[PDB]
Write a protein that binds this DNA or RNA. Structure first.
Ligand SMILES: Nc1nc2c(ncn2[C@@H]2O[C@H](COP(=O)(O)OP(=O)(O)OP(=O)(O)O)[C@@H](O)[C@H]2O)c(=O)[nH]1
Ligand SMILES: Nc1nc2c(ncn2[C@@H]2O[C@H](COP(=O)(O)OP(=O)(O)OP(=O)(O)O)[C@@H](O)[C@H]2O)c(=O)[nH]1
Ligand SMILES: O=P([O-])(O)O
Ligand SMILES: [Mg+2]
Length: 1095
DNA sequence: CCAAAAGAAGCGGAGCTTC
């Protein structure tokens, strides 16, 4: 414990006494931090970090000598050095702003004088920065080591923070704003996704600062200072960045949107550097100069990422030995630049790739206001992905003369749901544009003869990339489909690419050529296929054609099939057997493939099946209201409007309804994962309205080209044959929009009744300003809910089976109840420690608990079994970081603003998170982990969760391994895993100790609505133990089913495309049997095994 | 549904209050 002497030697002039018991001003920086046993930062001990690092960055030799290494990144050249010189000068400006801000803070309200007289301003939420000041005559000034080091972190953050931010979707923006997801204005998600919230900006900034400070937290110090001082610094640096215009602050007024929303929300956007700014080619020189082990860097050649010890954002969950092996294997993979695609991207140029793959140049007078904002979002994502690719290409290009021989490695970590996520936002795994330029897939193929197996593999790669559904047809039929396409519609695009692969040039009309040839086949991988096929055509040696073109072994309706296999817990039914075959589990058909299944046996997949069931359920709803003309008319109107704008809905001339797989895909999936119907309804309406806003632009684009054209032949000309036919379409639209906004269905005692809203749509349409408002969106949603979504939900249950629904409900309940108790106990143990600290004279309110105190509390919850263990994976469903534990500001800036709430790592309610956690985890997550670690694991692949990109040389073996990995994951029992955790929970829980809040929440999950009223502790305890029994019985069933199935002859082709199914070689032959016969025999084996447990 | 949370600011020195 010589840590007091150590840190005082480094900072002896900081104000106050490094004794928490001392009576005057106490220094909480020295009380909170210690020197690390091994150096973490090269700026520790430096009198002037900004001067030292600026000299370090002034030349290659100085950089190498400062980093104590023989050779620096070759990207650090003359042009990049000059840019860092200017950036170091800017750091001096930031530091100068910070010093002036401190001076003003000390002068305002005589704070400096009071602090000098003994007022403990260094313990205030806005004064924790006084812990790193030094006395300077009659005033105070920053410690220069600490100030300048924080500024260096500020500069690194400024350069790379945007590229490390998370992606905000509709759910995120809803959580941030307090506006219900379904009523979110258009472009609001775009506004919020492009910016950072305060917590988002400050916490990432604070993380950097503390990292560069290079010290270690004292476990016995209050989090109010260990987390508070760097956050205080981060907040002042953000404020300085706003003054300097490096960051823009936008306070978004929610009452402009929703008048009863009082929230005003800060949004921080970093000012973008030029795409051609040399600093982009090497944006981490500071990071790599300051830190002994840099986080932010690219991994070239034999420089490989280390293996993460803990789950992403779950410090309490250690990656298992099997997970770590998976991570090592994926980080070992070498990725390479495919030069022809980069050259193609470069030659088209940013502007043309925007025109082709985004929305091109937008003129804000032929575009609907709402549609214009969606198109701005489409352009942004493509643009950022392009710039990020070429920044990476600049760095790669410096490493060698031939860029295609520089190996690239990527860091991965295991997420909470057991997925191996590639770190970063613009890597091969996450960005489609990058995925076609940087690849691990490689093959040398003999394409000199089109009857080769090599040429067939090549064809499969091409067909899949061009939107041919390769898993639905045999290789032979596939081959003819591709040939027709290549020799037909794609031919003029192919001729252009031939010419590009000869001269390096593209014609002025390149975008038109590609757009016309590809149609709705257009994608980045489609461009890769045209590039690769044209390369083969001009290839000197077709006998040894080298290509990164891949085939994706892709999961067929993966999550739902996984759920059906992993969590169905009773006897076998013939419907289950038929429905699971749609996902590639074949019983009694040796060597059967998904290609064969879809072409000869059953052309309907699981989502098509559920759509078929929706059609049946819709008829049944129609018949219950046959005499009710207003009701029949509402239904007709909802269907009409959907038909008018959505591709997956069709109505024939005599009113025959046709539905495609695509409308059931997401609803089915997210229903299993616990979504409500309202959320599904809102999403279907969003897709309708987006199409309407898009059509409004098509109208303006018609009125400009032709002023004397009718609104009927402006909105429905491309959709209808004649003008009268376009007039009947327009009449339908106005009829539908009026009735669907003015009238809503309401469920009154199990009956549907129509009610007037009093807020129906009327008035002349102005295509530019046209917006379907919140009250009118609500009405469309309620119509969608009762007339489409509810029937879809009935259809969904029929398809996946009631037994699975029952299993997922029990899983949800157990995990929610357990999470409620963990949350509440933690909060109580925290409240009990704070009442104890209230007696401590050294302790002040605002100081929280120490890390050791929080670790003690977290470890005291272990007998409630917060972790689910599978033997190869660990899940912690309750785990979160939230502001509700400390319920207090952590730090503010020196203007009393940027008040960051204190966030704590603690358990919180799961809600429905247990279902997707366990299904994704033990489904696709376990499959991929197995695939990474299994005997003869496929090499040189890219894994994207439920599909794996494979080099053309290894498509057969890798697919068969992938299907084997699927079978392996189907030997799991997530309910058993949940049961084992919940059973331990149940012997240690004391429901009496819980708060009325916690008790109420458990009541909702464990009890029927008519029993939450007067529920005793003993009532909800008996109800909780009944769920334990239910879990036990389900887990037993799943266990038997899996054993029974292993004895039968099985062909597995869930990871489809190639036609390489895994054979389990089960010795009981169920060939030449109907599903009814198979179910009867499996059930005989079930009972046989069930009677074995009896004895 | 899930894969990461997330109002601002005056006055005063925490936490209530107004927008
Ligand atoms: N919780 C959640 N999971 C999703 C969602 N979308 C996709 N997933 C998961 O990712 C899996 C694979 O996604 P996809 O390949 O796009 O869809 P799929 O279910 O395999 O269906 P197809 O490939 O079209 O046959 C799904 O089965 C889900 O488990 C979603 O919106 N919510
Ligand atoms: N849990 C979860 N997984 C998702 C969700 N959406 C997509 N995924 C998974 O992530 C993968 C993304 O791979 P991409 O090839 O980039 O496809 P995408 O990002 O979904 O874009 P699309 O081509 O429209 O499917 C999908 O195949 C799914 O496996 C989601 O909402 N929740
Ligand atoms: O094009 P698919 O059949 O691999 O999805
Ligand atoms: Mg899939």
């Amino acid at each position: 414990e010589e840590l007091k002497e150590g840190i005082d030697a480094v900072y002896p002039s900081l104000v106050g006494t490094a004794d928490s018991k001392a009576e005057g001003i106490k220094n909480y920086f020295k009380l909170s931090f210690t020197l690390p046993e091994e150096q973490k930062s090269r700026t520790v001990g430096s009198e002037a970090p900004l001067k030292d690092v600026a000299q370090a960055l002034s030349s290659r030799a100085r950089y190498e000598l400062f980093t104590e290494k023989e050779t620096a990144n070759p990207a650090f050249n003359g042009e990049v050095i000059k840019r860092y010189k200017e950036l170091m000068e800017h750091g001096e400006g930031i530091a100068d702003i910070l010093r002036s801000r401190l001076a003003k803070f000390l002068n305002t309200k005589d704070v400096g004088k009071r602090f000098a007289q003994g007022t403990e301003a260094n313990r205030w939420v806005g004064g924790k920065l006084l812990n790193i000041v030094e006395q300077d005559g009659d005033t105070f000034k920053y410690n220069e080591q600490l100030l300048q080091t924080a500024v260096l972190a500020g500069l690194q953050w400024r350069l790379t923070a945007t590229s490390n931010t998370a992606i905000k979707d509709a759910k995120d923006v809803a959580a941030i704003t307090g506006i219900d997801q379904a009523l979110l204005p258009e472009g609001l998600v775009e506004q919020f996704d492009t910016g950072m919230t305060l917590t988002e900006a400050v916490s990432s900034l604070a993380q950097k600062i503390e990292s560069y400070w290079g010290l270690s937290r004292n476990p016995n110090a209050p989090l109010g200072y260990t987390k508070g001082i760097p956050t205080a610094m981060a907040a002042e640096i953000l404020a300085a960045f706003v003054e300097s215009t490096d960051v823009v602050e936008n306070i978004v007024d929610m009452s402009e949107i929703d008048p009863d929303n009082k929230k005003t929300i800060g949004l921080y956007t970093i000012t973008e550097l030029d795409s051609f700014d040399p600093i982009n080619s090497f944006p981490t020189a500071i990071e790599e100069a300051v830190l002994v082990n840099p986080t932010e860097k690219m991994f070239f050649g034999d420089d490989i990422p280390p293996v993460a010890n803990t789950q992403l954002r779950n410090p309490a969950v250690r990656n298992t030995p099997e997970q770590k092996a998976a991570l090592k294997a994926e980080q070992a993979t070498e990725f390479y630049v495919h030069t022809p695609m980069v050259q193609f991207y470069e030659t088209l140029g940013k502007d043309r790739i925007l025109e082709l793959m985004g929305a091109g140049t937008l003129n804000k007078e032929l575009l609907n206001d709402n549609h214009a904002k969606s198109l701005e979002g489409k352009n942004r994502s493509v643009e950022d992905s392009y710039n990020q690719l070429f920044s990476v290409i600049e760095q790669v290009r410096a490493q060698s003369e031939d860029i295609s021989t520089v190996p690239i490695h990527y860091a991965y970590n295991m997420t909470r749901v057991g997925r191996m996520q590639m770190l970063g936002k613009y890597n091969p795994q996450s960005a489609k544009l990058v995925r076609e330029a940087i690849l691990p897939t490689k093959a040398t193929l003999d394409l000199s003869n089109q009857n080769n197996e090599d040429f067939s593999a090549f064809q499969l790669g091409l067909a899949q990339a061009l939107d041919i559904k390769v898993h639905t047809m045999t290789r032979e039929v596939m081959s003819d489909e591709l040939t027709k396409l290549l020799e037909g519609n794609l031919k003029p695009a192919i001729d252009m690419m031939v010419e590009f692969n000869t001269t390096g040039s593209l014609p002025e009309n390149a975008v038109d050529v590609l757009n016309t040839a590809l149609g709705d086949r257009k994608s980045f991988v489609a461009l890769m296929a045209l590039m690769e096929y044209s390369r083969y055509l001009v290839a000197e040696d077709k006998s040894a054609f080298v290509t990164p073109l891949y085939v994706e072994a892709d999961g067929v309706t993966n999550g739902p099939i996984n759920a059906m296999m992993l969590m169905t817990g009773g006897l076998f039914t013939p419907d289950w057997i038929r429905n699971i075959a749609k996902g590639g589990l074949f019983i009694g058909s040796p060597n059967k493939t998904m290609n064969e299944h879809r072409s000869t046996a059953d052309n309907n997949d699981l989502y098509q099946a559920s759509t078929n069931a929706l059609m049946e359920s819709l008829g049944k709803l129609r018949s219950n209201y046959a005499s009710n003309m207003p009701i029949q008319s509402q239904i007709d109107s909802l269907l009409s409007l959907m038909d008018l704008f959505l591709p997956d809905i069709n109505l024939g001339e005599n009113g025959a309804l046709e539905l495609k797989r695509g409308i059931a895909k997401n609803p089915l999936t997210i229903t299993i994962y616990g979504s409500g119907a309202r959320g599904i309804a809102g999403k279907l309406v969003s897709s309708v309205t987006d199409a309407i806003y898009e059509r409004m632009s098509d109208v303006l684009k018609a009125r400009a080209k032709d002023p004397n054209i009718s609104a009927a032949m402006a909105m429905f000309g491309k959709q209808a044959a004649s003008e009268a036919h376009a007039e009947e379409l327009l009449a339908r639209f106005l009829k539908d929009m009026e009735t669907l906004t003015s009238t809503v269905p309401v469920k009154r005692k199990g009956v549907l009744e129509l009610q007037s809203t009093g807020t129906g749509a009327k008035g002349k349409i102005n295509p530019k300003t046209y917006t379907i408002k919140g009250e009118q969106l609500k009405a469309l949603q309620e119509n969608m809910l009762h007339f489409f979504v509810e029937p879809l939900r009935n259809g969904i249950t029929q398809t996946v089976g009631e037994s699975l629904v029952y299993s997922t409900e029990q899983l949800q309940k157990a995990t929610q109840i357990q999470s409620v108790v963990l949350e509440d106990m933690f909060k109580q143990r925290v409240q009990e420690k704070l009442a104890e600290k209230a007696k401590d004279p050294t302790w002040k309110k605002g100081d929280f608990l120490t890390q050791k105190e929080l670790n003690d509390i977290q470890a005291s919850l272990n007998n409630l079994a917060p972790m689910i263990e599978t033997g190869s994976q660990t899940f912690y469903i309750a785990g979160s970081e939230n502001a509700e534990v400390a319920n207090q500001v952590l730090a503010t800036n020196l203007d009393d603003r940027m008040r960051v709430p204190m966030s704590i790592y603690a358990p919180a309610q799961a809600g429905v998170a247990g279902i997707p956690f366990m299904t994704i985890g033990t489904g696709d997550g376990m499959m991929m982990q197995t695939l990474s670690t299994m005997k003869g694991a496929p090499k040189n692949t890219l894994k994207i969760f439920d599909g794996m990109n494979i080099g053309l040389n290894d498509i057969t073996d890798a697919s068969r391994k992938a299907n084997e990995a699927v079978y392996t994951s189907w030997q799991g029992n997530p309910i058993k895993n949940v049961y084992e955790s919940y059973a331990k929970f149940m012997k240690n829980v004391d429901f009496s100790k819980l708060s009325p809040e916690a008790l109420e929440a458990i009541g909702k999950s464990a009890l029927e609505y008519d029993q939450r009223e007067n529920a005793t502790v003993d009532d909800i305890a008996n109800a909780a133990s009944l769920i334990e029994r239910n879990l036990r019985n389900i887990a037993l069933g799943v266990d038997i089913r899996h054993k029974v199935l292993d004895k039968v002859n099985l062909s597995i082709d869930q990871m489809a495309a190639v036609g390489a199914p895994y054979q389990n070689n089960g010795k009981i032959d169920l060939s030449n049997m109907t599903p009814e016969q198979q179910a009867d025999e499996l059930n005989k084996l079930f009972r046989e095994e069930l009677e074995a447990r009896k004895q």
